[PDB]
DNA sequence: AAGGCCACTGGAGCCCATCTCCGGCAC
DNA sequence: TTGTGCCGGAGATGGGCTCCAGTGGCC
């Protein structure tokens, strides 16, 4: 599995909200605890010493393959910039609905 | 399969030799690395390959893909296979397989089988 | 007529089908590290990391 | 008896997607 | 900055994949 997939999977998953969580601004996310976030995806990879340091330079990673791309001005808040519309078959109003996204 | 550059790729293949030449082209005349892969639409770790090797050996083509070693044809067993064969040429595989635990250079696990003894007959 | 199995035994590929029943997510050396301790296969009958995923190919 | 035939194995090398270490740059 | 936060280069990893030498019942 892919970073950007491991994430969708999490922001598909209702009991994840406290550690990351979509914005509502269409394909937006934010990573709540940073750390946990670091922690779960090294523990699916099996890679023991995964932290937030690496799971960062993962997502830079991304910048320029336009998958994900990082918004200015705060932190830990990305955007999936894929067309995951395409992929999901759902529109972002129409999956935060599916997970009660506030 | 499409590779996060958007390259297709032939997952388990060598990347083409027409591409392999190109990486090494470009790299000659001062692309970074990084723009080689980028701009060719392979993973750097496969550009870093690319380069390394031949940097290191001269030639651009891949590693010997497939095949296997040998577990029962071991060179020992290769060679009192035909220590028997010189000595009699008529013995038949089966009893070739006979002496050969017969002296204990098999286990009833180690010992060839017919179609191998034959085979390695052929062979070598 | 070509050969039969010796590792990918009919209990071994129903075993491993079972594994990614549980947890898909499981990597190819995990399976036969149950497939070695439920002692399903002896450490001589256990597939290759290779066979497994030939198993999950198939 | 030996040879043709061929499903089955496992390790070889492959590219990929990171993992990891680290230098640059702005402040 | 003897630092922090962000960016991005490239050798190291190791996963599933295709290959294929080697093997052994069968006729």
């Not at chain 1, 937030?52 to 705060?74: C, F, M, P, Q, V």
Request: charged share 30%; glycine share 6%.
């Amino acid at each position: 599995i892919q970073l950007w997939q491991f994430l969708l999977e999490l922001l598909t998953d209702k009991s994840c909200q406290s550690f990351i969580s979509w914005t509502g601004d269409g394909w937006e996310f934010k990573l709540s605890d940073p750390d946990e976030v670091a922690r779960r995806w090294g523990k699916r990879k099996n890679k023991p010493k995964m932290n937030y340091e690496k799971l960062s330079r993962g997502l830079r990673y991304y910048y320029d393959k336009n998958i994900i791309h990082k918004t200015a001005g705060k932190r830990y808040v990305y955007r999936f910039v894929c067309d995951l519309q395409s992929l999901l078959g759902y529109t972002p109003e129409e999956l935060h609905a599916m997970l009660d996204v506030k | 399969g499409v590779n996060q550059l958007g390259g297709v790729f032939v997952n388990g293949r060598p990347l083409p030799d027409v591409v392999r030449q190109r990486i090494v082209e470009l790299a000659h005349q001062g692309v970074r690395p990084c723009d080689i892969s980028r701009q060719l639409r392979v993973s750097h770790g496969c550009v870093s390959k690319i380069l390394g090797r031949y940097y290191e050996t001269g030639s651009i083509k891949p590693g010997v893909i497939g095949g296997s070693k040998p577990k029962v044809a071991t060179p020992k067993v290769v060679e009192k296979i035909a220590e028997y064969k010189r000595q009699n040429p008529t013995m038949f595989a089966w009893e070739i397989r006979d002496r050969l635990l017969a002296e204990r250079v098999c286990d009833n696990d180690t010992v060839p089988s017919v179609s191998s003894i034959n085979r390695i007959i052929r062979t070598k | 007529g070509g050969s039969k199995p010796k590792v990918a035994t009919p209990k071994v590929v129903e075993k491993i089908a079972e594994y990614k029943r549980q947890n898909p997510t499981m990597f190819a050396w995990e399976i036969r590290d149950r497939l070695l301790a439920e002692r399903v296969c002896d450490n001589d009958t256990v597939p290759s990391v290779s066979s497994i995923n030939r198993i999950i190919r198939t």
